[PDB]
Amino acid sequence: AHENVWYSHPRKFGKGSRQCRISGSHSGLIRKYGLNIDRQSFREKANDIGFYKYR
Amino acid sequence: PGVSVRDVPAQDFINNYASFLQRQGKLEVPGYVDIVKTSAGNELPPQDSEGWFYKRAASVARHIYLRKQVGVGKLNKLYGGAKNRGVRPHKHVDASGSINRKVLQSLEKLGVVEISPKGGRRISDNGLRDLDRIAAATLEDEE
Amino acid sequence: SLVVQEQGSFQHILRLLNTNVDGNINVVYALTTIRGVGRRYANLVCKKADVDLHKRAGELTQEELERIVQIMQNPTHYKIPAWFLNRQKDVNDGKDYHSLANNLESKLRDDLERLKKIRSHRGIRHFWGLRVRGQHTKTTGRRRA
Amino acid sequence: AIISKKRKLVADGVFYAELNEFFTRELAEEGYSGVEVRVTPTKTEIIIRATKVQDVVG
Amino acid sequence: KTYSYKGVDLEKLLEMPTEDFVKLAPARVRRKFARGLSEKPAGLMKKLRAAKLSAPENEKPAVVRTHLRNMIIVPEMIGSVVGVYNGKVFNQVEIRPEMVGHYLGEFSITYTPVRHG
Amino acid sequence: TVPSVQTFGKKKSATAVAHVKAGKGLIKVNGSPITLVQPEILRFKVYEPLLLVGLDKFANIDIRVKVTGGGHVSQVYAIRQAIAKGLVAYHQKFVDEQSKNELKKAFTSYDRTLLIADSRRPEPKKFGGRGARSRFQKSYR
Amino acid sequence: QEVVIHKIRINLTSTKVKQLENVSANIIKNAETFKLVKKGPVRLPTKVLKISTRKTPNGEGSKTWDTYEMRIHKRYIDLEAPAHIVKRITQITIEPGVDVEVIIAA
Amino acid sequence: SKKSHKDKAKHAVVLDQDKFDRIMKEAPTYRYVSVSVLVDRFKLGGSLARVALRHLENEGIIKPVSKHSKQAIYTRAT
RNA sequence: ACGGAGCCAGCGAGUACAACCUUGGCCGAGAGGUCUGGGUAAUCUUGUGAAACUCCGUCGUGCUGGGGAUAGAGCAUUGUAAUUAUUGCUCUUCAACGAGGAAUUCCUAGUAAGCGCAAGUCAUCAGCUUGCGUUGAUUACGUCCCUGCCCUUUGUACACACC
Ligand SMILES: [Mg+2]
Ligand SMILES: [Mg+2]
Ligand SMILES: [Mg+2]
Ligand SMILES: [Mg+2]
Ligand SMILES: [Mg+2]
Ligand SMILES: [Mg+2]
Ligand SMILES: [Mg+2]
Ligand SMILES: [Mg+2]
Ligand SMILES: [Mg+2]
Ligand SMILES: [Mg+2]
Ligand SMILES: [Mg+2]
Ligand SMILES: [Mg+2]
Known part of the structure; x- marks a missing residue:
């Protein structure tokens, strides 16, 4: 774990640059309006957030 | 009575203005004409090999007369249609920017187009005067 | 008329x-x-x-x-x-040419045999007759004719 | 703090989700019921509706 | 003709700096070298110069193994034997004068050819 | 003040706002006279109120139409309805009852949409198909 | 000595309607109570904040989606009004949900 | 990749003097003139169909009924 | 089909502890580059001057100016990094393809279909999806014949239930 090599790869962008903010997952992420919550947790917490099924 | 460009059909007025601009020796064509697609959307140069630049200048001048003021990027959005992207769905491709820039600078040299404070370029009193004059020319040409 | x-x-x-x-x-x-x-x-x-x-x-x-x-x-x-020419920058002598009827196919053949000899991946793929520009081949071009 | 108003409301919602889930994790032994986030010109009041209020206070 | 790259002769090809080749090289190389360079290709160049120096002047120099595939073959690199990582094997390749312009990855086939039947 | 009113006519997403005044028989759309409507083959569509009523009915009446939104033919139908409704409203407001009733009899006995806005509007699309009310395809194997 | 009019501006936001309308009505009533000239609670297009999402957490099942959304209503107000009474109005009659913001613009 | 039609040149790519006297002789007696009608008689390629068709508007040999693009509608002058 | 000319939308989205939407002015043929200026948004991109479409010409039944796959060379952009072509652009080779068997899919009004745009994926990349709007129909307005569904009656040696 030499500091020059450990976690040395850049992560400024791409699939793994940002995480789920709920689960830390990198799949099925919703970046719209800075939600940064994956789709399933969004479906779970939408009503608390302010999102509702309307039409 | 008095007549503006709005009282004459678009295509006939544009053709007549192109012919009038071609007849007189002003409105220099850039040395790179006969070379260019006029946009990435097209795949061939204009069928009218010489004189098409006058048509484009006439259309541009009429457009600035009708609208508020128009820059170069807006003209790029105006001209240019759908590119045949091989085996992919067509999209909208903006027109070539150099051609429209040269058109606007040539219209500036002719005095028909003035730099607008709000950005872009608007119509000038002398140029709009010639536009009304040639609109009258076309209108009494019709009958 | x-x-x-x-x-x-x-x-x-x-x-x-x-x-x-x-x-x-x-x-x-x-x-x-x-x-x-x-x-x-x-x-x-x-x-x-x-x-x-x-x-x-x-x-x-x-x-x-x-x-x-x-x-x-x-x-x-x-x-x-300089642009609009067929073969520009000409990687044999650096002079932008334009290949023609016999010259085009011939020089393409020398370029192909150069890629074969150079042992490049593109060259060996060309020698095999497979797709070169990186397309899937599971379903594409499955018939010679 | 300057940010798009729609994004600001989305952030307020996700912050309320933050608070609600954290309080659910913590005050579960307290018979936690709900949380209200009231915003005043100066203070961000956070009302906790729970059963064992006296133990919640501690 | 024996070999010229872009009008620059083979004899000039052996003795010539990287930057002139960059100016001679196509657009992709131009952007790559204009975008700055990693330290790893510099270390590879140093090791490979050392390997060329070490060989007693009349055999093929000792193969230098390397994982780097993303850097290209400059005129200084000719006359050298490098083992490019293939996923398992540092596949051998001797760097010919026609190496130039290309990367190393073209000569370490990351997949085995498929045979049916 | 000059006797003048403002009416409008709509299509799917087109909207023509027409100002009618006591003028000199002056009919412009977007600042251009009616004879040069954007298209060419629906031109008679936009003359239709003119010829159905008769030009002499409004010879001292001027027309100014600004049409926005929607495609070409939707805009044309918008100008149609706007001009017709402007004529009817002006005759009701300042001319007489029988005149307006005769205009309505001439209009509604021909292409009812001339005075009544069209009720059809686009159907929202749904998941499971590329169309508003179409599905994608089935495989079954 | 604050007789200089600040031509101040009061804008609002919410995800709801009745509370926002109530706050705006109280603001207008307060302005009228002290003889204030104003531009009314001009309505702004309710911005629909929409996200489409697949329902299945695992991709299996018939293709079924859903659309969650809020609306934001803005209803900004500007006042050609004195200093202290306007500010006192801003720091009073605040309802959770609706967010009040004040711009002097003087 | 077929060969079924087996079509010949079947079109006068360049007008010839005898063909000119032809096109002029039945410039009348063709009570309806168009591009397709002109090339139906094997004497016009189709690009010069428009050329001869526009040329006939010289001394009023035929009259126009409509001059929309993509076609033409001409009757015999009477 | 290709040239010019006409010039028409509605859903969106858009930068802060980061670097987004980009106008406008200069360059380049284009992608693009550069200099400035707006917009934390009915304010600026944006009237998203979108395509199909319309008008006037070139083409003329020729796998042809259709079709643009497969390749050769070059120019740029994002990227630590692009070869196994990221993607865009310029010149060229231009293949199969002649309305497609058995069979089978979707759909009864702003519907199908054609046409594109926006948003989600996004540092770069859609031929995808979710939405939106443009032009906009033929044919039903019925039936249990095929495939099934609902209720009732009947028969059953079936109940892991006609697999
Ligand atoms: Mg165009
Ligand atoms: Mg066209
Ligand atoms: Mg096509
Ligand atoms: Mg559809
Ligand atoms: Mg073609
Ligand atoms: Mg719009
Ligand atoms: Mg357009
Ligand atoms: Mg061809
Ligand atoms: Mg997908
Ligand atoms: Mg039915
Ligand atoms: Mg049993
Ligand atoms: Mg059985």
């Missing part, structure tokens, strides 16, 4: 750069029938030669053919830009 077109002079067959070309087609699209020359390049070559665009290839005169031929072998002399 129309002309009798001087019966007895309108050619029907031509041999420009050792390929037979039918002359009744429009000049630019008649020139398009030689390898290494497309509608755009032929159109520009005809434009620079001052020959009429709407003319017919079987009716334009001989010195017109040789002037067109001269234009379309050393384009950079006649103000054809």
